[PDB]
Amino acid sequence: MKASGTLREYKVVGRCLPTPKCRTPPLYRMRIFAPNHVVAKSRFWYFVSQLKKMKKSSGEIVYCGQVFEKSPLRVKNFGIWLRYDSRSGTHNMYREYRDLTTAGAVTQCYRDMGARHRARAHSIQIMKVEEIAASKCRRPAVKQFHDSKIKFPLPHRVLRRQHKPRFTTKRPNTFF
Amino acid sequence: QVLVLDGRGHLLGRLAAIVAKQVLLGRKVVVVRCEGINISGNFYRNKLKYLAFLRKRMNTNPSRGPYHFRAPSRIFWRTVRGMLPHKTKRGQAALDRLKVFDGIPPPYDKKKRMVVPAALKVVRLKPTRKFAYLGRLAHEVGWKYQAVTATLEEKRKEKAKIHYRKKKQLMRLRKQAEKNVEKKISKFTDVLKTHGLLV
Amino acid sequence: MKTILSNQTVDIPENVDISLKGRTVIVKGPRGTLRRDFNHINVELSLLGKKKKRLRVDKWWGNRKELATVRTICSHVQNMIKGVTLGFRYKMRSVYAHFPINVVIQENGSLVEIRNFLGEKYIRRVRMRPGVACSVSQAQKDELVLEGNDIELVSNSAALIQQATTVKNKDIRKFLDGIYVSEKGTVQQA
Amino acid sequence: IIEPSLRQLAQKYNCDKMICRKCYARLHPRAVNCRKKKCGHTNNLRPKKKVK
RNA sequence: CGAUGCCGACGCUCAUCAGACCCCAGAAAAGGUGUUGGUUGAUAUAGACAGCAGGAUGGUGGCCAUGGAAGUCGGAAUCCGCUAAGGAGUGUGUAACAACUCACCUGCCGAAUCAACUAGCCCUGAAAAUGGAUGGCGCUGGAGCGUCGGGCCCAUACCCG
RNA sequence: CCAAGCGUUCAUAGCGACGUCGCUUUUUGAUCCUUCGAUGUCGGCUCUUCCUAUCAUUGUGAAGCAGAAUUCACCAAGCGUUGGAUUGUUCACCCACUAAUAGGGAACGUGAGCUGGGUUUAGACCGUCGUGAGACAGGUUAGUUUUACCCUACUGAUGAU
Ligand SMILES: [Mg+2]
Ligand SMILES: [Mg+2]
Ligand SMILES: [Mg+2]
Ligand SMILES: [Mg+2]
Ligand SMILES: [Mg+2]
Ligand SMILES: [Mg+2]
Ligand SMILES: [Mg+2]
Ligand SMILES: [Mg+2]
Ligand SMILES: [Mg+2]
Ligand SMILES: [Mg+2]
Ligand SMILES: [Mg+2]
Ligand SMILES: [Mg+2]
Ligand SMILES: [Mg+2]
Ligand SMILES: [Mg+2]
Ligand SMILES: [Mg+2]
Ligand SMILES: [Mg+2]
Ligand SMILES: [Zn+2]
Secondary structure, X not given: OOOOOOOEEEEEEEEXXXXXXXXXXXXXXEEEEEOOHHHHHHHHXXXXXXXXXXXXXXXXXXXXXXXXXXXXXXOEEEEEEEEEEEOOEEEEEEEEEEEOOHHHHHHHHHXXXXXXXXXXXXXXXXXXXEEEOHHHOOOHHHHOOOOOOOOOOOOOOOOXXXXXXXXXXXXXXXXX | OEEEEEOOXXXXXXXXXXXXXXXXXXXXXXXXXXXXXXXXXXXXXXXXHHHHXXXXXXXXXXXXXXXXXXXXXXXXXXXXXXXXXXXXHHHHHHHHOEEEOOOOOOOHHHOXXXXXXXXXXXXXXXXXXXXXXXXXXXXXXXXXXXXXXXXXXXXXXXXXXXXXXXXHHHHHHHHHHHHHOOOOOXXXXXHHHHOOXXX | OOEEEEEEEEXXXXXXXXXXXXXXXXXXXXXXXXXXXXXXXXXEEEEEXXXXXXXXXXXXXXXXXXXXXXXHHXXXXXXXXXXXXXXXXXXXXXXXXXXOOEEEEEOOOOEEEEEOHHHOOOOEEEEOOOOEEEEEOOOOOOEEEEEEXXXXXXXXXXXXXXXXXXXXXXXXXXXXXXXEEEEEEOOOOO | OOOHHHHHHHHHHHOOOEEEOOOOXXXXXXXXXXXXXXXXXXXXXXXXXXXX
């Protein structure tokens, strides 16, 4: 899986194909964070295969649909439990992020896990995602935004329009 | 016609890349105060970089090159020459459209100097990063005219300060004049405000 | 991790006057003025209050290295306050097993001449920093008193003397001769 | 002969030191890692041996 | 040198040998209180962790082993009393006295602290002969590394003629 | 690199087993990619240059550094690193002086630069081998060392824009 663009949360339901022994096999569900649905179904078969004697040939996808964020206009803290392979082992991690959508927090996770650990998305298995209350957060980087009277300036504002004009008579100002 | 740039506070490589493209497109460029140019990285590691360059010489006849120019103007000139196809007639013609100076000699001393915000150190370097001065670097690899350039740059600035004070004197009069003739120019001032030329 | 805010305050004695010109602190007190430029640190200096005057140093969005400079500025400024009020007095003792170290002060305490160090014929001359005055301590034998308003100048002046009297090509665990800083005090006790 | 108090004053600067085992640097007594990059800031320090 | 002259996104990294793209044209074990991120385990508002006091003895200099080791050098055992506590002992010293410092404990001040592992980038490990090569210049709010967006560039490939 | 030991004590001042990770291409191999319409095959002499894995000297850190002497380590290749007997020798050994008498590369630098002592044609002797002709990383003696006026480089000399 390539963590291309902002990921989406998918609800994927599958089962074993019915057989004479078990005319109605049980249904299984998974939360899949993927770029599109075609990827979402592929990763489902990769996870259920790891947990059950199942695979695409001997099973079917009963339902694939996007799970929309329930409060996209509200700030939340997310706790993400994941395991990943490094160059020399496998590790479990718990990470926290502040976002508006759960799929956004997961996308932050992939970009962050790539930045801080050189982890490609094919080695990362997100186990669990939960919305966490400000009192239950552990990471100091997230907790410092739990401040009802938060305030801070924007020092040394870098000039981003550096080629319009390309040549100018006046030097830029970084204080605003 | 001629694009005059101020070398103070600019990063060597970034300015050269922009200056190299301008002279390839056919524009005449003058860069002044090449000793004011900056290089990212602490001074010592930039000094080492040039001392390694000084070691490059034809073992059998050092007079045959490379030539290691010690002036900040020539160091910058050779940097721009490194971003041009200077072994073709096109590249050499472009290289002739660039003039490089230490300090600001005439006639550029009495002309407005442009900057290149894409090459400005304040724009391109995080404020915590160390940087080097091309003038100090050049002086410490054999440049002989650091003190004289500074002495003459101190005389120019004293003259520039006098010129500015005269300009401020003339602007104070201008604002006073706009007040004395406020009634005679009111109709023309509404035309400008109507069309944004005066806020 | 970048921390939103990190600040530390310094309390200014009523007899000290602190003024800011950007990141330049000017501490004026009974013993004179000190000026230090902190333009190399991206902090924000403020003066708070009018009766009990304080100096605040703020660092927004700093990393671990940047945060460590907030208290460094505060300590420097306190030393400047300590300098313009109490002064700095560095006492140095001359240690010798056989050959006395004869020290002669010259130029009103701005030049220290050291003779007979481990018996050497060479004469050592150490130039104190501006604003620092050396003198032989009248209270004790083999003791120099360096006084000044700037800790960096005064404590750097003592370092020059201590390194001037360095033993060479010997076992310095045995040849302990030298002039060493023995106490870091203030000119006026209070 | 040096007075015992002045012996301790000189010894504070000449003997009470740690020694980096990898690069021989002179370090303050409470040092836990060397200050030199040449050894990679190693924690293999030892006391400066006392003169007998 | 054709095309990012995008108001590209989030991080990581400072190198007094930085890094920079299949084959491929250079590096290992082992290390770092550089920096970042994680795992586990402790202790702290009954107020923790530094910083600022005392304590080296009561049975006892425990008996063995000693030319001689009293707590202090080895070999198996390694108890109590008074108490805020006190190892029948952490370090100090000879050929023996002699000697002091920690385990401990409370006086103080008032928010996080400590330990061990683990993995990223950087660093040490890292020495060759003509002067020298991420292709070069150069580049550090990146023109480096990881994960990702739009856009654009051009083969004799693909489409229409 | 680990650290069992050594070092009276004490792993790591200085060493370091059992193990293990590397670097170099001044050793020998392994291979047979280039050269058999020919790239002159050892050593010395002469001459310049470069490397550092530093013997000496400058500035330093550590010792089981009292001094003297010495040993370990750092920045470091600027300047030095010699005269001789035996041998073709490289290598070696000794004598003598020295601050020191370090180690190497440049087509195992250098034969249109020399020399030709050795190796490696044709003569000849000895030993072993062969019936013999003959052979021998076995000894011995005698055995032709060609050309620059071309291009470049270099050294100097006129000069040219
Ligand atoms: Mg010269
Ligand atoms: Mg000595
Ligand atoms: Mg290209
Ligand atoms: Mg067609
Ligand atoms: Mg032992
Ligand atoms: Mg073959
Ligand atoms: Mg041929
Ligand atoms: Mg030839
Ligand atoms: Mg030939
Ligand atoms: Mg070296
Ligand atoms: Mg040869
Ligand atoms: Mg030849
Ligand atoms: Mg020949
Ligand atoms: Mg011959
Ligand atoms: Mg013959
Ligand atoms: Mg026979
Ligand atoms: Zn060290």
